[PDB]
Design an enzyme around this catalytic site. Structure first.
Site, mmCIF file in Angstrom:
data_model
loop_
_atom_site.group_PDB
_atom_site.id
_atom_site.type_symbol
_atom_site.label_atom_id
_atom_site.label_comp_id
_atom_site.label_asym_id
_atom_site.label_seq_id
_atom_site.Cartn_x
_atom_site.Cartn_y
_atom_site.Cartn_z
ATOM 1 N N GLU A 24 0.825 -1.203 0.000
ATOM 2 C CA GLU A 24 0.000 0.000 0.000
ATOM 3 C C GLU A 24 0.862 1.257 0.000
ATOM 4 O O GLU A 24 1.846 1.353 0.740
ATOM 5 C CB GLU A 24 -0.938 0.016 1.212
ATOM 6 C CG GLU A 24 -1.916 -1.145 1.273
ATOM 7 C CD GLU A 24 -2.971 -1.082 0.188
ATOM 8 O OE1 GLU A 24 -3.200 -2.110 -0.482
ATOM 9 O OE2 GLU A 24 -3.575 -0.004 0.010
ATOM 10 N N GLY A 25 0.485 2.219 -0.834
ATOM 11 C CA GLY A 25 1.147 3.509 -0.874
ATOM 12 C C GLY A 25 0.214 4.595 -0.380
ATOM 13 O O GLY A 25 -0.904 4.313 0.050
ATOM 14 N N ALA A 26 0.669 5.842 -0.446
ATOM 15 C CA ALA A 26 -0.126 6.970 0.029
ATOM 16 C C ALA A 26 -1.427 7.127 -0.758
ATOM 17 O O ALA A 26 -2.388 7.720 -0.269
ATOM 18 C CB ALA A 26 0.688 8.254 -0.030
ATOM 19 N N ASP A 140 7.598 17.130 1.034
ATOM 20 C CA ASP A 140 7.437 15.912 1.824
ATOM 21 C C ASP A 140 8.611 14.965 1.625
ATOM 22 O O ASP A 140 8.432 13.758 1.487
ATOM 23 C CB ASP A 140 6.113 15.211 1.503
ATOM 24 C CG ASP A 140 5.648 14.293 2.622
ATOM 25 O OD1 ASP A 140 6.093 14.469 3.777
ATOM 26 O OD2 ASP A 140 4.819 13.399 2.351
HETATM 27 N N1 LIG Z 1 8.182 3.129 -8.739
HETATM 28 C C1 LIG Z 1 7.926 2.322 -7.715
HETATM 29 N N2 LIG Z 1 8.484 1.134 -7.538
HETATM 30 C C2 LIG Z 1 7.924 0.689 -6.423
HETATM 31 N N3 LIG Z 1 8.229 -0.475 -5.853
HETATM 32 N N4 LIG Z 1 7.113 1.637 -5.939
HETATM 33 C C3 LIG Z 1 6.321 1.559 -4.867
HETATM 34 C C4 LIG Z 1 5.600 2.680 -4.476
HETATM 35 C C5 LIG Z 1 4.785 2.633 -3.350
HETATM 36 C C6 LIG Z 1 4.697 1.467 -2.601
HETATM 37 C C7 LIG Z 1 5.426 0.350 -2.982
HETATM 38 C C8 LIG Z 1 6.253 0.406 -4.096
HETATM 39 N N5 LIG Z 1 7.073 2.586 -6.725
#
Ligand SMILES: Nc1nc(N)n(-c2ccccc2)n1
Length: 339
Positions: A24-26, A140
């Site tokens: 999960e990302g932002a 950030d």
């Molecule tokens: N460009 C890139 N590569 C990964 N693994 N990213 C990633 C971005 C957010 C959460 C996990 C991985 N973003």
């Protein structure tokens, strides 16, 4: 039907297959996937911002900025996937180079050699020089927004909180609300600054440098208020000259109310650190933002002499000069080039 991942739709069309849930990302769910046109695995992040004006703002910022920028140390957007019409547009998928890891994950488990710290710091500042040359503030910067590939090429990501610099309108009152990540927040944010000047980013880079040196965040504030406690606990009490630069009475008198604190020498906090790195650290983590080192000066610092080359540290060709429904339309328009 569309591909599913862990319950929800991850609909990236036929070009991108063999999805793997990365985490999960932002913005939401992130997956790896095989790019059938370029024969490489890529990162794809799913964005669903349209119900909320705030989410739309950040998504638009992320997209507009990353699409304009082209720099080795800033993550590019390779492709954007979405529905052919605004009415059908439900989610947006942003496709980027797949990056092995990031500085947050790396620092959790890996000790960095001085060579790695130097190289990482150079790349961060090289990327930051470009960003600042475009009159943009990232706002950030932190380890998790610094991506790394298997050969330690570093790319700055997440411009969702970025702004165009506006130093004439930087002043505000004491303890004014702020959104950027607490531990990397410059002291002036809690005192009298909206974070509209380039010096805000340099402070964050200083924190990142400190964290690379010890694998621990230097100012781990437990809450908004605590953050300034930690900063002053190490820098010590501000000088009269530095207090005099803060006209706001609430902010100034707060500082005056504190018992005296002495500076903790950097070489006692980081006994194993390169002395030149500590000199640069001190200049990035300067209390007074007007006296804080700027990105171009940081690049020219002796710590980075092995890498410094202004002709190979490019600036932006075209700097940035300044409801959800219109935002969805703007996002739709900004992503049109990939259809
Ligand atoms: N460009 C890139 N590569 C990964 N693994 N990213 C990633 C971005 C957010 C959460 C996990 C991985 N973003």
């Amino acid at each position: 039907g569309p591909e599913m991942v862990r319950g929800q739709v991850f609909d990236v069309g036929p070009r991108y297959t063999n999805l793997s849930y990365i985490g999960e990302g932002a913005y939401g769910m992130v997956c790896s996937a095989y790019d059938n046109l370029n024969k490489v695995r890529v990162a794809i992040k799913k964005i669903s911002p349209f119900e909320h004006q705030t989410y739309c703002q950040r998504t638009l910022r992320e997209i507009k900025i990353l699409l304009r920028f082209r720099h080795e140390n800033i993550i590019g957007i390779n492709d954007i996937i979405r529905a052919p019409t605004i009415e059908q547009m439900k989610d947006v998928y942003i496709v980027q180079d797949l990056m092995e890891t990031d500085l947050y994950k790396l620092l959790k488990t890996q000790h960095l050699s001085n060579d790695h710290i130097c190289y990482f710091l150079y790349q961060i500042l090289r990327g930051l020089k470009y960003i600042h040359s475009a009159n943009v503030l990232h706002r950030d910067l932190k380890p998790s927004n610094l991506l790394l590939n298997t050969t330690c090429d570093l790319k700055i990501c997440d411009f969702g909180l970025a702004r165009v610099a506006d130093p004439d309108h930087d002043h505000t009152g004491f303890l004014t609300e702020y959104v950027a990540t607490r531990w990397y927040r410059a002291p002036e944010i809690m005192l009298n600054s909206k974070g509209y000047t380039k010096s805000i980013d340099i402070w964050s880079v200083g924190c990142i440098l400190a964290e690379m040196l010890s694998n621990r965040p230097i100012f781990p504030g437990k809450h908004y208020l605590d953050q300034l406690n930690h900063i002053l606990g190490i820098l010590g009490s501000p000088s009269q000259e530095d207090l005099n630069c803060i006209i706001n009475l609430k902010a100034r008198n707060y500082l005056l109310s504190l018992p005296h604190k002495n500076k903790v020498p950097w070489n006692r906090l980081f006994p194993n650190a390169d002395s030149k790195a500590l000199d640069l650290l001190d200049k990035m983590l300067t209390f007074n933002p007007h006296k804080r080192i700027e990105v171009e000066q940081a690049l020219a610092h002796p710590y980075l002499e092995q890498y410094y080359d202004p002709s190979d540290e490019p600036i932006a060709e075209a700097p940035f000069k300044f409801p959800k429904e219109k935002l969805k339309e703007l996002i739709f328009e900004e992503t049109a080039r990939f259809q």
